């Protein structure tokens, strides 16, 4: 929207290196140092939440992009979600494999 | 921990929020440029409010971070820009007197109306009235009367505001680690905290007089030629030994000589290059103009310009339904959106300033990866440098012949190259000593070691020796004539139009030693050469994040100015100047006053 889809947010700070196979849902404030936040502070707490905006007059590197990441699992269990499509009609009275 | 990373994170948060705020402000600015309405006026009022408030509050909050404790010079210079208090170092009464005097002085300059001759139903402004009596007018007397009346009506309204302006700027800058407001103009042109390639503020001063005394004799010869030709155009009032009146140069301030081309034509049988005939026979409108522009981009080596301009901008007149202005501005929204304000028509000057604006757009996308403190040139002259380099390398018709833009019936003889070189010399080289003494004079005014009430007589008598121009009538100290300029009344950095004037030649040599191009430097085509394109790109993508001196070594190879490429750029014109005004007097004399 021209007002801007500011609902989407990201973290430009984090407590440590984000590990794979885990989603840190909480966006809790990563403190910089040398000073207490004394609650939630403007100049010296550095809340990591930042917005996008994503107005239609943005740029190609600023374009709202929809992302889906599919990840399989190699855990101790075989496959359950495959494509079993074979789909040949029928045959009869013919020397055939099947 | 360390306060360095705390300042870094504050810079990152400020840069992100400033990106969003300047995105809104630039969208508002473009909408005001294309349409001047009541709601657009409200939009600019709100944009100015939010922008000034955010900038002053972040500058106030940045003062708690120490400056020179960071080894990373990028965020150190980001703090240096951010912790600039500016006008915050003094109180509010001087600031509000500054606002009242300056806004009254600006609105007096903008609609300053000369209304002395004839009936007062007409009052000749810059574009409707002064442009038809200064750019083209075949009467010395009417030009003298109108220019003198204009100078009087500007002076008696501008001077009492400008004296307090000079005092206020000196006492503002003396608290912000500057010795004067001229030092603030040279504060951006300074490298401190970076080892080795040091640049200081007086270094640019001595560079300026060094360039003046270097390019003195070329100006002597072109002054002799233009004086000899204005003996033909304006006889019976100018002596061959003396100087020239400043209301006949084609520029009311005395700056340019661009329209003083037909009166000072080198060869009557051969004009300058005019490819516009095949354009008007070609139906080459603005859409095909920009298609040829992107073809020229690919031919030079630059990437093709993005579609984000196309659905966001227009290139022709929109009629009178919306209040768009035909001012060539390359607006950047700061979030990957580029817009170009230009009424692109079938006019060679419009195409060359379209080259200028799209070179500005190219340099805008060159620093695209940098944050909001760094999406600029390292000084203000780099944008105009890229634009004028693009304009000058686009001014060679050999590439137009090669791509088929110019038909092969034309040939580039020595006559046409002399015409083109005189056009370029009278356009931007003809104001090199003009910009020189105006910058030097405004420096030695704002530094304030000089007497106060004697500026006009000294300024009107020292112009007889640098450019060699004389006032026909004396001007008393009630005048304020140099403050009749857009770069003095609005008071912008006029060194930008000085130093860039050498940029567009010196980097030109840097773009012809990499293009494997020989002969005269003016006939250089950066097109069909990837090496010169990438060498231009090397300076292009640096931007603001580095000190400008460093960029000057990786494009040229010096801490100081590569002045001498000007002789390479103008060698056939210099030879023709030597062969032409050898018999006529070369130089000027102060005592001759018309």
UniProtKB/Swiss-Prot annotation, chain A:
The lineage of its organism: Viruses, Riboviria, Orthornavirae, Pisuviricota, Pisoniviricetes. Changing residue 50 to N: Reduced host ACE2-binding affinity in vitro. Residues 1-65 are annotated as: Receptor-binding motif. Residues 5-13 are annotated as: Immunodominant HLA epitope recognized by the CD8+. Changing residue 10 to F: In strain: B.1.1.298. This is Spike protein S1. The chain holds residues 444 to 541 of 1273 of the full protein. Binds to host ACE2. RBD also interacts with the N-linked glycan on 'Asn-90' of ACE2. Cleavage of S generates a polybasic C-terminal sequence on S1 that binds to host Neuropilin-1 (NRP1) and Neuropilin-2 (NRP2) receptors. Interacts with host integrin alpha-5/beta-1 (ITGA5:ITGB1) and with ACE2 in complex with integrin alpha-5/beta-1 (ITGA5:ITGB1). May interact via cytoplasmic c-terminus with M protein. May interact (via N-terminus) with host bilirubin and biliverdin, thereby preventing antibody binding to the SARS-CoV-2 spike NTD via an allosteric mechanism. The gene is S. Residues 12-47, 76-98 are annotated as: Disordered. Changing residue 10 to F: Decreased HLA binding to NF9 epitope. Increased binding affinity to human ACE2. Attaches the virion to the cell membrane by interacting with host receptor, initiating the infection. The major receptor is host ACE2. When S2/S2' has been cleaved, binding to the receptor triggers direct fusion at the cell membrane. When S2/S2' has not been cleaved, binding to the receptor results in internalization of the virus by endocytosis using host TFRC and GRM2 and leading to fusion of the virion membrane with the host endosomal membrane. Alternatively, may use NRP1/NRP2 and integrin as entry receptors.
UniProtKB/Swiss-Prot annotation, chain B:
Changing residue 291 to D: No effect on interaction with SARS-CoV spike glycoprotein. Its EC number is 3.4.17.23, 3.4.17.-. Keywords: Carboxypeptidase, Cell membrane, Cell projection, Chloride, Cytoplasm, Disulfide bond, Glycoprotein, Host cell receptor for virus entry, Host-virus interaction, Hydrolase, Isopeptide bond, Membrane, Metal-binding, Metalloprotease, Phosphoprotein, Protease, Receptor, Secreted, Signal, Transmembrane, Transmembrane helix, Ubl conjugation, Zinc. It comes from Homo sapiens (Human). The gene is ACE2. GO terms for molecular function: carboxypeptidase activity; endopeptidase activity; identical protein binding; metallocarboxypeptidase activity; metallopeptidase activity; peptidyl-dipeptidase activity; transporter activator activity; virus receptor activity. Its cofactor is Zn(2+); chloride. Changing residue 71 to P: Increases slightly the interaction with RBD domain of SARS-CoV-2 spike protein. Residues 1-594 are extracellular. Changing residue 333 to F: Increases slightly the interaction with RBD domain of SARS-CoV-2 spike protein. Substrate binds at residues 255, 327-328, 497. GO terms for cellular component: apical plasma membrane; brush border membrane; cell surface; cilium; endocytic vesicle membrane; endoplasmic reticulum lumen; extracellular exosome; extracellular region. Changing residue 255 to Q: Complete loss of enzyme activity. Does not affect amino acid transport activity of SLC6A19. The extracellular region of the ACE2 enzyme is composed of two domains. The first is a zinc metallopeptidase domain (residues 19-611). The second domain is located at the C-terminus (residues 612-740) and is 48% identical to human collectrin. The cytoplasmic tail contains several linear motifs such as LIR, PDZ-binding, PTB and endocytic sorting signal motifs that would allow interaction with proteins that mediate endocytic trafficking and autophagy. This is Angiotensin-converting enzyme 2. Glycans are attached at residues 35, 72, 85, 304, 414, 528. The chain holds residues 19 to 612 of 805 of the full protein. Changing residue 221 to Q: No effect on interaction with SARS-CoV spike glycoprotein. It is a single-pass type I membrane protein. Optimum pH is 6.5 in the presence of 1 M NaCl. Active from pH 6 to 9. Changing residue 21 to R: Increases slightly the interaction with RBD domain of SARS-CoV-2 spike protein. It comes from the Eukaryota.
